[PDB]
Amino acid sequence: DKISHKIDIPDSAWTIGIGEKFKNAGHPNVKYPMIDDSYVQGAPLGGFGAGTIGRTYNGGFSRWHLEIGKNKYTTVYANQFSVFQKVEGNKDGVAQVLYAGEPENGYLSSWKWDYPKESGMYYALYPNSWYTYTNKDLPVQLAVKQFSPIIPYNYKETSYPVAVFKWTAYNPTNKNVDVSIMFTWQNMIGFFGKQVNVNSGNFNKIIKDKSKDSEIVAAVMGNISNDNEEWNGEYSIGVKKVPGVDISYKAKFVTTGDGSDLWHEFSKNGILDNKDDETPTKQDGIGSAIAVNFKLQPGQTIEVPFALSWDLPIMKFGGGDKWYKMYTKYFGKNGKNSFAILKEALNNYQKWEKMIDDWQKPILSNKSKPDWYKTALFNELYYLADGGTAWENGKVGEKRTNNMFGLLECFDYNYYETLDVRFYGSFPLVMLWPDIEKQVMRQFADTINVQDSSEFKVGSNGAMAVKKVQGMIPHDLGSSYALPWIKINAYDWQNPNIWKDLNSKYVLLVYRDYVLTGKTDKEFLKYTWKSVKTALDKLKEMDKDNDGIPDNEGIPDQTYDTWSMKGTSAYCGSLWLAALKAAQEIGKVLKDNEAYIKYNEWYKIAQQNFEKELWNGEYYNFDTESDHKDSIMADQLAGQWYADILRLGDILPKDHVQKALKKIYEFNVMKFENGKMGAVNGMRPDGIVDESDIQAQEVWTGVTYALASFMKYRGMTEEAYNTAYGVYKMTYDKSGKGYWFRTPEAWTKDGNYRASMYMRPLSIWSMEV
């Protein structure tokens, strides 16, 4: 490997061999069908709300999130980089697709598949990833750095449906070598959203943009239809000319054929026919190819950038609504702008790289932090793009000042902005994209007094319940299968209108968002203040016995939605205490004296009774009335965790908090698989895992990372990082279960999982507060 020295891969990048088999992989541990796309994954490409494309460590474009809210795992075999090399003096050259696999059927059988094992590595530190190619039959070593411009405090380039592939080639040998790199792409119009005639009218054109000291050559793969529908738009691939390289292309090859129309050209001398052909197809799939060819002398290095863009301006949800995607603000809405997007990337990628380096550098340069922690911190952010992210720039056929946003809980439970989970998962947004975070919170503020008296069947018990109650915060802002932002509370497993955590978490999120953006945004507090007061006032009515604390009702009425709480719970009770203290502080800021006095009164009473009812001398009991009320819950002091972040001081005595955290580390971490797998949710005081429900026997990745941040704030530095390390290990390490770029909600002691590609573990960013 001589190519690594010619590029700059951070030591904290996650790494795996190209073509590596992984033997230890986990699988779903639930009764019903659950997504398991395998461990062959990679860091995604694509901006927020753009639709994303997962190119795996084996090289294939395989995890398709272009249909917003959906996960489709299938390798589109025509989409590849390929290489040709010929040593000067040799009769023939060699050609090879850079994909560690082959197609299932006879399509593209002429291409040279099965990139060999032990001949290259994949690296990832989101939003960047890299591949190196170090192959005994390829004298010139090659590397590529690929990325999308995902940039904190930037809401423009961060939205773009574009990827850059920056190639580096180096000749370590003593002979001249002719080298070609070719990018192939299928015209994927009709891949989704088209019921019939899926390729019909697809056509490819070549764009040659020549202007002093710039040449870009690109293929634009579109459809003859000028219709404005979810399925219609354009894909583009292309390359920017650099000194010493020539560009060739082929506008149209058949993807539903043996591929020899293209490959016979590339495999001969690495030079394509430059044949333009705009003839639209009928049944056959078609694609385009862009290649560069150059000669590398001994010791010579060349860099050449390719790019990929996709202009699919309209997202459609299952309930029928069509919306424009965010990036259309910058490029237009007509779906004929793929080249413009591509060109912007090819002309500005070096600037984008520096912007990404500038935001990663403060963390990467901190030598007090272990590299494994940095691996997790950056790579967990994949989910902000890969979580079915929806970011609208207008309803089709409708202008507003704001652009609504939504991140999925996950794909198995297809619910946007599950607030009980975003309490954990939204840290990267408040810390790095705070304008998005505040918009989402205003979305919730706007729903507070919505009432929908239509009824739905509750999944857990079969009872009927009202969809949305006035003054209750919704569980979610809908489903991609229905009407995001329009029909809220799509979730029906439990009735969220009786949950005891949503209203308090809402208030805590509001105040968090004020504190972590500098305590200057009074307008955000003013916007949300009525909803905050309403939320707390409604939750106070759920106190059955006048101890000043809402009563959990002996069913799962909070985020642990199969784990029953009854009476005063440590979890919901501490959240309530903290929410009251937050609301007192907002009341002071907004000069609402009567609110300050009322919430201060409620706080003092609740605090006294919480301590009396739950403090057992070692930790806080799970609750006051359940069968296993004395279980040690990993999340027992969630309200104090947030109070620390919000700078609200002690809601419970420091000594008691430290004892409880130490107990959790001693039991829920260290007595669960020797502390190598995170914090199990519930442990009996005899040191055996609580079996009252499956969720008690699960480690929740986002709960564990948040607990690690709580420990860190409280000076339990070793415990914090040891607790978090178990989650990193399970997710990323060779000894783990192969969950990279699909971190699940949960695993059990056998390491098998529930709900891959999950929102909650974004909470690792709470460790950076």
Ligand X SMILES: *[C@H]1O[C@H](CO)[C@@H](O)[C@H](O)[C@H]1F
> Which chain residues interact with Ca ion by CB under 5 A?
543, 545, 547, 549, 551
d(CA 395, CA 418): 22
For position 559 contacting ligand X by CB under 6 A, the verdict is yes
Return the range that interacts with ligand X (CB under 6 A); candidates 179-187, 364-372, 418-426, 443-451. 418-426
513 binds, among Ca ion, ligand X, none (CB under 5 to 8 A by kind): none
Main-chain dihedrals φ then ψ at residue 400, nearest 5 degrees: -110, 165
Q: With CB cut-offs between 5 and 8 Å by kind, which of ligand X, Ca ion, none does residue 547 bind?
A: Ca ion
| C-beta closer to ligand X: residue 119 or 756 | 756
Residue 763 found at the interface with ligand X (CB under 6 A): no
CB of 426 to ligand X, least distance (A): 14
Residue at 203: amino acid letter: F
Residue from 230, 311, 380, 420 touching ligand X (CB under 6 A): that is 420
Is there binding between residue 417 and ligand X (CB under 6 A)? no
Tell me the C-alpha distance between 232 and 282, whole Å: 16
Q: Is 549 annotated as a binding residue?
A: yes
Task: Give the helix ranges, DSSP H, for 405-458.
Answer: 419-425, 427-432, 434-447
- Which helix H or strand E contains 96, and what residues bound it? strand 94-97
Cis peptide upstream of residue 127 (ω within 30 degrees of 0): yes
How do the residues of the chain divide into helix, strand and coil, expressed in percent and rounded to 5? Answer: 30, 25, 45
384 and 422 in contact (C-beta within 8 Å)?
A: no
Q: Which is nearer to Ca ion, 547 or 644 (CB)?
A: 547
Residue nearest to ligand X (CB): 559
CB of 70: closest distance to ligand X in angstroms? 17
Instruction: Name which of 409 and 551 has its Cβ closer to Ca ion.
Output: 551
* Residue 547 assigned as binding residue: yes
The answer to whether the CB of 640 falls within 8 A of the CB of 607 is: no
Indicate the SS3 state at residue 169: strand
549 binds, among ligand X, Ca ion, none (CB under 5 to 8 A by kind): Ca ion
Contact 424, 763 (CB under 8 A): yes
Which listed option, Ca ion, ligand X, none, makes contact with residue 418 (CB within 5 to 8 Å by class)?
Answer: ligand X
User: Residue by residue, what is the 3-state secondary structure of 105-125?
Assistant: CCCCCCCCCCCCCCCEEEEEE
Measured from the CB atom, the residue of 491 and 765 that comes closer to ligand X is: 491
Cross-strand bridge partners of residue 176: none
User: Mask of contacts with ligand X, 716-745, x by CB under 6 A?
Assistant: -----------------------------x
User: Whole-number minimum distance, CB 561 to Ca ion, in Å?
Assistant: 21
Choose among ligand X, Ca ion, none what residue 344 binds, the Cβ cut-off being 5 to 8 Å by kind.
none
Q: Which C-beta is closer to Ca ion: that of 309 or that of 552? A: 552
> Within 13 Å of residue 15, how many CA atoms lie on the same side as its CB?
12
Q: Which pair of tokens denotes residue 522?
A: 């009074």
Stretch that binds ligand X, among 249-257, 282-290, 417-425, 576-584 (CB under 6 A): 417-425
Q: Could you say whether residue 697 binds ligand X (CB under 6 A)?
A: no
Q: How many residues bind ligand X, per CB under 6 A?
A: 11
Name which of 560 and 672 has its Cβ closer to ligand X. Answer: 560
- Residue placing its CB nearer to ligand X in the complex, 232 or 489: 489
448 labeled binding residue: no
Give the integer Cα–Cα distance in Å for 100 and 296. Answer: 26
Give the span between the Cα atoms of 208 and 635, in whole angstroms.
59
Q: State in angstroms the smallest separation of the CB of 759 from ligand X.
A: 9
Residue 118 or residue 545: which is nearer to Ca ion going by CB? 545
Q: What are phi and psi of 16, to 5 degrees?
A: -155, 150
Choosing among Ca ion, ligand X, none, which partner's interface includes residue 502 (Cβ < 5 to 8 Å by kind)? none
Task: Determine if residue 209 is labeled as part of a ligand binding site.
Answer: no
Could you tell me which of 78, 41, 75, 79 has the C-alpha nearest to residue 57? 41
Q: Which does 392 bind (CB under 5 to 8 A by kind): ligand X, Ca ion, none?
A: none
Angle at 237 between CA 232 and CA 239, to 5 degrees: 155
**Is the Cβ of residue 430 or residue 746 nearer to ligand X in the bound state?**
746
Residues 374-413 that bind ligand X (CB under 6 A): 409, 413
Which of 491, 732, 740, 747 is in the footprint of ligand X by CB under 6 A? 491
Tally helices (H) and strands (E) across the chain: 16, 31
d(CA 422, CA 761): 10
Give residue for tokens 């009786």.
498
Rg (CA), the chain: 27
Of 125 and 755, which CB lies nearer to ligand X in the complex structure?
A: 755
Judged by CB under 6 A, the stretch of 416-424, 440-448, 500-508, 512-520 that binds ligand X is: 416-424
Least CB distance from residue 29 to ligand X, whole Å? 12
Q: How far is the CB of 505 from Ca ion (least distance, A)?
A: 18
Distance of CA 697 to the CA centre of its chain: 26
Q: Enter the DSSP assignment of 332.
A: -
Residue pair 569/682 in contact (Cβ under 8 Å)? The answer is no
Q: Cβ(504)–Cβ(414) under 8 Å? A: no
Query: Does 501 contact ligand X by CB under 6 A?
Result: no
Contact call for residue 415 and ligand X (CB under 6 A) = yes
Q: Is 545 annotated as a binding residue?
A: yes
Which range of residues in 78-86, 414-422, 576-584, 682-690 is near ligand X by CB under 6 A?
414-422
Contact 301/141 with Cβ under 8 angstroms? no
Query: In the bound complex, what is the minimum distance in angstroms from residue 47's beta carbon to Ca ion?
Result: 46
Q: Which residue has the tokens 């001994």?
A: 298
Q: In terms of CB distance, is 565 or 586 closer to Ca ion?
A: 565
User: b/e for 328-344, b at 16 or more Cβ within 10 A?
Assistant: bbebebebbbbbebbbb
Question: According to the binding rule CB under 6 A, does residue 557 interact with ligand X?
Answer: no
Residue ranges in contact with ligand X by CB under 6 A = 409, 413, 415, 418, 420-421, 491, 559, 561, 745, 755
| Residue stretches of the annotated binding site | 543, 545, 547, 549, 551
| Residue stretches of the annotated binding site for Ca(2+) | 543, 545, 547, 549, 551
